[PDB]
Amino acid sequence: TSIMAVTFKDGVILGADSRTTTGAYIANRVTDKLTRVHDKIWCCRSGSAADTQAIADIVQYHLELYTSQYGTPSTETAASVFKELCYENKDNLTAGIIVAGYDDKNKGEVYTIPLGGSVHKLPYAIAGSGSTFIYGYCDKNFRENMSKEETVDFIKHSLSQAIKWDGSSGGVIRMVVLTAAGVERLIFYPDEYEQL
Amino acid sequence: TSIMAVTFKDGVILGADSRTTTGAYIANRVTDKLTRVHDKIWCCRSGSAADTQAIADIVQYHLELYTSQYGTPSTETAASVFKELCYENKDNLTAGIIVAGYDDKNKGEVYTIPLGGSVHKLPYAIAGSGSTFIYGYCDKNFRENMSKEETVDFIKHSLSQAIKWDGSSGGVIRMVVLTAAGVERLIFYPDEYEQL
Amino acid sequence: TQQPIVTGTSVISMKYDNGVIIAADNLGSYGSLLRFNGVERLIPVGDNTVVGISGDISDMQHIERLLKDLVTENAYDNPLADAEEALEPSYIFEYLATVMYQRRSKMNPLWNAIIVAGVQSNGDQFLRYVNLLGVTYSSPTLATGFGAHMANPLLRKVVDRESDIPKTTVQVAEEAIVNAMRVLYYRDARSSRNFSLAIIDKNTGLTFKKNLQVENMKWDFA
Amino acid sequence: GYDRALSIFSPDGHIFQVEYALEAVKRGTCAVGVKGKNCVVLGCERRSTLKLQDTRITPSKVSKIDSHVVLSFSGLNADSRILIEKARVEAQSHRLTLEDPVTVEYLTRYVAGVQQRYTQSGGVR
Amino acid sequence: SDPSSINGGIVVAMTGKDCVAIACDLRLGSQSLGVSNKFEKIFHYGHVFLGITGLATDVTTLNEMFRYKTNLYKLKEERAIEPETFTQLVSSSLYERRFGPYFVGPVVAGINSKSGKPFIAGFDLIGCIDEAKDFIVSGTASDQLFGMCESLYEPNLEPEDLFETISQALLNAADRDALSGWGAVVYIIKKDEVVKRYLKMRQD
Amino acid sequence: MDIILGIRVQDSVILASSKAVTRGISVLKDSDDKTRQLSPHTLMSFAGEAGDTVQFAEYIQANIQLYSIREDYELSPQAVSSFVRQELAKSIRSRRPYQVNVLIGGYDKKKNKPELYQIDYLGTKVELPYGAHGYSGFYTFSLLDHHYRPDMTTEEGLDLLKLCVQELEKRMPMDFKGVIVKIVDKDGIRQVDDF
Amino acid sequence: MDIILGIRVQDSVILASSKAVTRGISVLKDSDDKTRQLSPHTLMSFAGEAGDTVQFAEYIQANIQLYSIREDYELSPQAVSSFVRQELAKSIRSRRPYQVNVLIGGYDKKKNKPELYQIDYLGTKVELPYGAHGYSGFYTFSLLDHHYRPDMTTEEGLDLLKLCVQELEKRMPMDFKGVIVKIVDKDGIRQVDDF
Amino acid sequence: TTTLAFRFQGGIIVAVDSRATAGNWVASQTVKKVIEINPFLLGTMAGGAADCQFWETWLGSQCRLHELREKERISVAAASKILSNLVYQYKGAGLSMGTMICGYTRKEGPTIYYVDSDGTRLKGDIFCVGSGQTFAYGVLDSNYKWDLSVEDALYLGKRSILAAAHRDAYSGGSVNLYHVTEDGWIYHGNHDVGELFWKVKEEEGSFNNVIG
Amino acid sequence: TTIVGVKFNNGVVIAADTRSTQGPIVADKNCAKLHRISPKIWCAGAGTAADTEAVTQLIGSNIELHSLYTSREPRVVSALQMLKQHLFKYQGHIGAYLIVAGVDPTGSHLFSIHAHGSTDVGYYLSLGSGSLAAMAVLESHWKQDLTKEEAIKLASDAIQAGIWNDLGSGSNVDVCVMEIGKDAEYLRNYLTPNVREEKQKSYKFPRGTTAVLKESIVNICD
Amino acid sequence: QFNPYGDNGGTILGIAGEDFAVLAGDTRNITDYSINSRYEPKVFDCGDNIVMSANGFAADGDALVKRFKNSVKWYHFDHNDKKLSINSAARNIQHLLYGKRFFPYYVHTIIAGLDEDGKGAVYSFDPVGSYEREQCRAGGAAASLIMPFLDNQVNFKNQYEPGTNGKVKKPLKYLSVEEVIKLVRDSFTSATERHIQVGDGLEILIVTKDGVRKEFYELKRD
Ligand SMILES: [Mg+2]
Ligand SMILES: [Mg+2]
Ligand SMILES: [Mg+2]
């Protein structure tokens, strides 16, 4: 995998490639690594497909039960539940998850959770095997309070490069836009992003 | 290490950090990884300090003996001698070398030689542990036929990022300019490059 | 049985005439990747104690939550929570020390080296170390990781024994700490330029300094 | 688990459940033991309101606990099987650990201890 | 199967006022089994004395080798080898087997016949010279010998007093080691007389 | 432990078992009886891991004696052998299995027939005219394949057994210090003192 | 291989060596002579790795016999023992070392004295009043520490040796099939046939 | 360690050394390896010092509880089996013990049981246990007769430990002697090998391998 | 071991401690780690003690022969080249870690060599188990344009850091000063801050205390 | 893989007189080649005139001392303030240690005090609870250096009466507290010279019928 999430003026956007791997064989070239845990709280999944799926399923269950009792959970709360699962089961898990959500009070927020189960709140986050190749690019190009179109271009260009160099990444670039307006799904095909 | 070499309009420039490592202890923070094998043929060294030094010493001896008999060797010839040593002793070596030189016929040329001992002629090359973090940046920012000032900025910005993310890289940024005019040594300190 | 993932490097500290100083950089390393740069590794407990932590960051964040919870629990049914029955540095340490040794004894350690710096209610300086093995010790100067090898020698030139503590001012002590941090940036491959520093004085109290930078560096000499 | 304290003291200091258990013994068929100079004889009554019995297979009144000790009883027949079984198991357990069969005093002390335990344990009579 | 502790044994050397002493135990065993109680570990080539601890086959071999080499030295040089020179010869010979070494802990002792100066020296298995004013120790009870010597030793002891000090150093060290003991020999060395004494010690 | 043999003849079962108990480079005892009487007409010999052997033998002995007292009746050799097999079959999948191999020699009084059962630590049971555990079988089975007849007397069986012990004393690497021989027949269990 | 003993008395050296050759679970031979005469007044017994033992013994025998013919003279026991030690000391740092332990019993005709040398495969030589290789020493050394006197006769030495064999036959785990005894004195080497 | 105990005409002799080792380091020369369970029972210790020490004093407490409950001193057989059944429960866990339970009772007479940490329990007349057991066996077996006098038996036991103390590197210190009769055990002194060896050498004429 | 090298105005200075260990045991309390390759080229060596001594003697021997062959004073880069090619050939199996320094017709020089065959260059260097304690001092107090007496002070201070803070280092400080135009000046035991205090008691025994079995005169003459 | 044990170095020593007993120990605490503290005491007054030290892995050492101190407290609560005799303390400590037979306290334990006849007593334990009363015992890193010296000077081993042909031994006698402290100080200075993990300071606890007294002495800091 290559995955990322980026905050901007109107909220936050999540991004991911679509490649699933078993050694050098691509088991699925149209994977959906962006997963809904709540209406406007989503996560990017990297690491083991089975581990990250089982975690996201448990989180979605927890937040559904939270909502039934206490109403809409904060993005911080969602990240805390991910952390609790990742930290307490660190010996048996291979999961690198980025949590991203939109509040109306807090606007866009991004939390990254690496292998150990630590939590880190950031303006933007990158993760997955392909992220290594874009640390330089992303640090140089990220600005705070970007527009929607600018943030889409930032993610598109970033994941394009990650895909170009990482063999474990490829296929389509999926994105999910989280704003006050609602939830928008975007897709970008090789013929567009490859020649950027 | 983080190292690179870049061709441009007037010739070629080599670049490197100054960190030497023994585990997490910095054995030397002012290392010179850019090595002269001939008047206008230089190399960037990465991997084992002892292996790369022994190779560069043998190459310098070979090219000095070449010059005595057949005059100035081509940059391709210098790369071939590096390759021959790296390929035939692949089991006992840990050396990633970039070769760069200036001819008047061929202008600037860059050859990269990875672990296996293969040769690859390129417009520019990056290598060392820190190179992983700038594949994205360098591919997006490199143009052919750049000016001297543009190429210096490209290398300065690139190695700045490599240094920022790689713990095995740091110290000063050394550069060596190879043109018809001669050989120029440049140095850039943390206080300048860190805040780029 | 664990292995540390996201890690923090040296924590350094020393006693001076009226109190203690402690410092640690703001980096969260991921192996050789210098991944996170806004990480605070000094955590104050009340107005009289600062706990400095190195090692695994997920375990550090767990210890943060434990200390946060300890403050809450101490306030319960305690009218003197902000006076005579406030949390002392010695209480906070012994608690952490107990936890560390219990976890090592269950073969599932918290992968950390910890320094508790503070001032007791009677004015006495408190400075003590504890790690993943549950090993504890005290000294006029204390440091973890690389700090133990490089900072301690420098800090021991200022305070070499007990009798040197009354003779050392806060200006002299902070100068030695700040110098040691520069040396660590030169020589530790997992240090950052940015760091935090905390002073706990028996008169002026807790002073927490953020976003400090290593400066006045010598390179000009290759 | 069923916990009720069934054997308890009464105001006069009697444990009625234990005393009523003695009434069950009083109802049982008569048993007698006489020891001589070189032997012990155990005699037992068998009620004759039961004709058409098969004496080959009907449980005998005197039971061997080991090859050298015997146990007869008076009272509830079903209850006696539980005591006999436990005694027989302790007999073999003693031979196993001490490498010597039980003394008659020891075997008796064990059986009596079992009986006592059922007078101050919850959920049992 | 640690070559330096199969057979067992110890050697110690000390300097005094115009004299030197070198002592060793007599045990040779095969791990737990004691085999011989007559196995001496001190040899001499002219006035230069060499003690060797470690694997006994190498002790024997090296003695035979240094006898060989000092005999040729004397024939060519027309003089007896001195302790300082012999020390260098031992070092060279051991380092020659750098990547296949003799498993030994040799100790040189003697008085330079020209200057009259008392001299002692020690080596690791690979040739590193360890020179000392006071004492050199070697063998399976080296820790014990280090402790005994460091506390008991004082400078400029007379030959008769030095005998008592070195003997008590060896004896009490040997009794705290399972693989050392079974008898002991002490050499007291003056400029032109050498006295050899066998010590009475516990035989367990 | 080490050598345990068994031969079933016309009217009896004969068990021979080595007397040596060796630990390290020392023979600690040369008169060890590697057998337990389970019931008047049933004998069990055993060999295997130290401690395990006697612990298992005595545990089985206690259980069969408990059965005998409860029912005032002697279990058949076949029934005892099946009980022992099941205990070992349980044991093999336990946290720490009993590493014990046994032979069971018995005289069935209802059938008036001798019976010999061979059971290993896995719980592998077989009825045999002659049996052996461990390295002994590698010599004795072929020997008995040749010399054994089904209609032999107890005396003929003892001579056939002498032939086995002689062969083992000639070709086996270890000194097993002779054997204790015991006969199981209609009249119960008795020991041959001069072998 | 396995058991080799040696005793030096007033006027002779006596060597006792086990007769068994065992491979796997089979004693292949019970009359094996684990000794070679190196010279008329020098005998060498040996024990260790299969093949290596005889190959080494015969190689030494050839060399000493070659010396004898060349110089028309018999090497002293001390000289032979030193030659053998050096061969083993070379061997231990070879690509494949000789895994052989030896005892050398000789009568020095110039000194009129018996001599017994014990040498292991590493090349560790010692002169002894009595010697043993392998596990044998763990019993015999203490026994001889008690009963041995330096002024004993050959007959007294043989009785002292009977006491060692008896102890080994009682406490050793393996059947070594007795010993071949040989005496080395002023009149050369002879074998005791009834032991 | 070296420890022995043998049966004879006049009861039981029990003899042990007193050395403790940690590898080649001689930790102690004055260890007590015989434990006095009651006036008629003795236990010997070989193997893990703590294992032996802890579980044999524990055994003593179990024997005391037996005579309180049964109003009769425990048999040597039953006492040995308590220990053997205990160690069998720990089989595989790594306990290291070689013990001998020696004593007299009316029903048994003089009795010796060998008990070790892999669960082996053996009745016998002669046993030697420890790293130096073989050295003790060599002397003991070659001088043992049933008809030895109390004086001679005491010496043979003492002499057998001395033999092992001398040859076995991991045995030594001193010899502790005990004699068990129908009337109970009798202590026959601590004998330092430092003096005992030279005294035996001179008086007996043995140990000719050593430089006199 | 702690060893350092420091460049100054008109030359270079090297220093070392004087403790030699075998495991945690101190074998020699005053061993000399400062070696002579040529009169004005000196080596400081850490690692395997026999390897540093042997490799320094071999190259020193070959340097003398080379000097005689060329009729020239030997250069530091020649010793550097020969040591590095020898050590590389043996792939680190010869455990010699050296600081090479000296003066020659080309000027004053300071290098270090690792066991596998890498050379280094610097104005200040440190090798050995106490190198981190020494380097901390060097990074704190070094400056461009040091005088002779300043460089000696800095060098010995860096060695002292190792002596006090590293368990592998102890006892005394040896120094060698190599100045351009002057003879190299070797200062054995330049500092002795670890003198053994007076013992509480004399352990001289009464004569006759040791029991003796045999006496005999040993013949050393022909 | 996580290793739950570590080695904190140092060494301890106990000697018993006629009416007194001493328990000494150095104050240095280490890991690998670094010093953690120059003054970290490891000899403790546990009440009832019992002094105790558990040397080796400090986390296990502190845990054991902590548990035994607690055992003394509860012994008073459960048995009417009865004084815990040294022999009873010893047996109690055996059970503390053996209780962790299959995950041991990695320490060497020595206790000192007076027996019930008023005479000096020293008991020593192995890591799993094997114990023995002695006149004399050294424990820890330098035990192998000190113990043979104690055999010679306290128990007069290998010392015979002069002129008696090695037939009469030097008679055993009790030593005065002045004589014992001389042996302790010499033992620790000797150990400091030849063992890297031993130094900094020496703390002696002396036990008489009047109570527990302390004495401190400087040791070499290299
Ligand atoms: Mg791709
Ligand atoms: Mg011994
Ligand atoms: Mg130090």
Side-chain angles (χ1 to χ4, degrees), chain F residues 25-26 139 169 171 175 177, chain G residues 25-27 139 169 173 177:
Chain F
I25 59 163
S26 298
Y139 289 99
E169 280 176 353
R171 298 295 182 184
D175 194 343
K177 305 296 185 193
Chain G
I25 59 163
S26 299
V27 182
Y139 289 99
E169 280 176 353
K177 306 296 185 192

Side-chain angles (χ1 to χ4, degrees), chain J residues 15-213:
Chain J
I15 301 168
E18 193 178 355
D19 65 332
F20 72 98
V22 296
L23 215 199
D26 67 327
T27 64
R28 177 178 275 179
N29 185 296
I30 66 97
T31 47
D32 300 329
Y33 283 98
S34 281
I35 296 165
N36 301 327
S37 177
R38 297 197 187 274
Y39 183 75
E40 183 66 32
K42 67 200 171 223
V43 186
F44 301 101
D45 188 353
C46 300
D48 285 11
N49 262 219
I50 301 161
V51 288
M52 175 173 168
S53 190
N55 189 241
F57 178 44
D60 280 353
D62 287 349
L64 187 69
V65 167
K66 201 156 179 176
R67 284 227 289 161
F68 175 72
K69 275 188 173 178
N70 194 226
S71 188
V72 173
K73 197 188 184 193
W74 280 99
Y75 185 82
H76 294 322
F77 285 152
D78 293 323
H79 305 89
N80 197 228
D81 275 326
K82 175 178 177 170
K83 197 197 181 186
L84 183 64
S85 57
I86 197 79
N87 70 290
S88 298
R91 179 64 73 80
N92 175 228
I93 291 168
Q94 170 170 78
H95 280 82
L96 291 176
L97 290 162
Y98 201 88
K100 275 171 65 61
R101 168 63 176 76
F102 302 108
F103 183 22
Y105 288 117
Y106 236 77
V107 281
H108 278 107
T109 314
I110 300 173
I111 62 166
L114 305 171
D115 68 1
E116 282 163 303
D117 292 325
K119 289 189 174 139
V122 166
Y123 285 81
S124 62
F125 305 78
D126 83 337
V128 280
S130 185
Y131 78 93
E132 183 200 7
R133 191 186 174 176
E134 290 165 299
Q135 281 292 125
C136 222
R137 195 42 111 164
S144 59
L145 284 78
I146 299 168
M147 196 60 201
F149 173 70
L150 268 29
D151 297 331
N152 187 226
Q153 295 297 308
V154 180
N155 293 326
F156 305 134
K157 295 280 181 72
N158 294 118
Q159 290 198 245
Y160 289 91
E161 210 86 57
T164 60
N165 193 219
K167 225 98 280 217
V168 175
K169 301 172 78 173
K170 187 174 197 254
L172 302 171
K173 66 160 178 285
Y174 287 112
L175 288 82
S176 63
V177 70
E178 287 80 16
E179 266 298 302
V180 168
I181 288 182
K182 284 181 184 170
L183 295 170
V184 168
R185 287 189 68 181
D186 285 348
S187 291
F188 269 92
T189 48
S190 295
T192 301
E193 290 291 301
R194 293 290 179 177
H195 203 109
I196 65 171
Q197 301 174 340
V198 177
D200 294 321
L202 169 62
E203 197 160 70
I204 310 167
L205 275 72
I206 309 96
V207 182
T208 61
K209 59 171 169 65
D210 292 15
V212 181
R213 184 173 80 261

Side-chain angles (χ1 to χ4, degrees), chain F residues 29-188:
Chain F
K29 199 174 172 179
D30 61 7
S31 65
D32 185 51
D33 193 1
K34 294 164 180 56
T35 211
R36 293 300 145 115
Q37 182 178 136
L38 307 185
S39 67
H41 301 100
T42 296
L43 186 69
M44 187 172 78
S45 61
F46 46 85
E49 175 62 25
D52 285 359
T53 50
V54 177
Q55 282 284 170
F56 179 76
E58 291 182 0
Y59 164 73
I60 295 301
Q61 186 181 48
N63 272 108
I64 301 302
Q65 285 177 6
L66 179 60
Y67 192 103
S68 288
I69 282 293
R70 185 184 297 119
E71 310 301 336
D72 192 37
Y73 200 69
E74 181 173 21
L75 245 19
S76 71
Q78 200 291 129
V80 170
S81 70
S82 293
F83 171 76
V84 170
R85 195 205 82 82
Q86 194 183 51
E87 286 298 304
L88 290 166
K90 280 185 205 161
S91 170
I92 199 59
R93 290 172 197 279
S94 307
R95 194 186 49 77
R96 199 178 63 75
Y98 283 114
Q99 289 180 61
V100 183
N101 299 308
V102 303
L103 297 171
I104 291 168
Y107 192 89
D108 194 325
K109 296 281 278 178
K110 308 212 84 165
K111 288 178 168 188
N112 290 302
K113 269 180 159 63
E115 281 177 358
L116 174 70
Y117 298 95
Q118 186 176 139
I119 313 169
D120 72 4
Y121 73 106
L122 303 171
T124 316
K125 192 184 95 175
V126 178
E127 204 280 319
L128 294 168
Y130 38 91
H133 272 300
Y135 294 121
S136 310
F138 284 89
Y139 289 99
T140 60
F141 273 119
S142 61
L143 193 153
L144 268 12
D145 280 350
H146 185 49
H147 292 114
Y148 175 86
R149 301 290 182 276
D151 66 336
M152 290 169 86
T153 57
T154 299
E155 270 297 319
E156 284 173 304
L158 290 164
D159 291 342
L160 197 69
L161 197 69
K162 282 182 79 186
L163 226 56
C164 292
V165 173
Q166 278 165 22
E167 176 59 7
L168 295 166
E169 280 176 353
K170 181 165 175 62
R171 298 295 182 184
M172 282 272 159
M174 77 299 175
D175 194 343
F176 62 90
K177 305 296 185 193
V179 292
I180 284 167
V181 178
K182 304 198 176 197
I183 306 162
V184 188
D185 58 22
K186 62 183 170 70
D187 298 307

